Design a protein around this ligand. Sequence first.
Ligand SMILES: [Zn+2]
Length: 75
Amino acid sequence: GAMSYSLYGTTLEQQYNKPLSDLLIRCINCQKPLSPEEKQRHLDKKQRFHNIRGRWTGRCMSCSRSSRTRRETQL
Ligand SMILES: [Zn+2]
């Protein structure tokens, strides 16, 4: 279905019926669209992100690691 909430990415393929590989998906701090690479963080390592209508917001590598430095424009 859909609503804003946080979900295990690994399960997102059922969610929208349009998977990560199709869903515009972006970092949460970056708003940078994460590709299958950073999506696989949420799939493989199953990092929990947020689900949004038509897209979402997750954490790219930089952010999934350096979460302590929370900036949206990173400067
Ligand atoms: Zn990021």
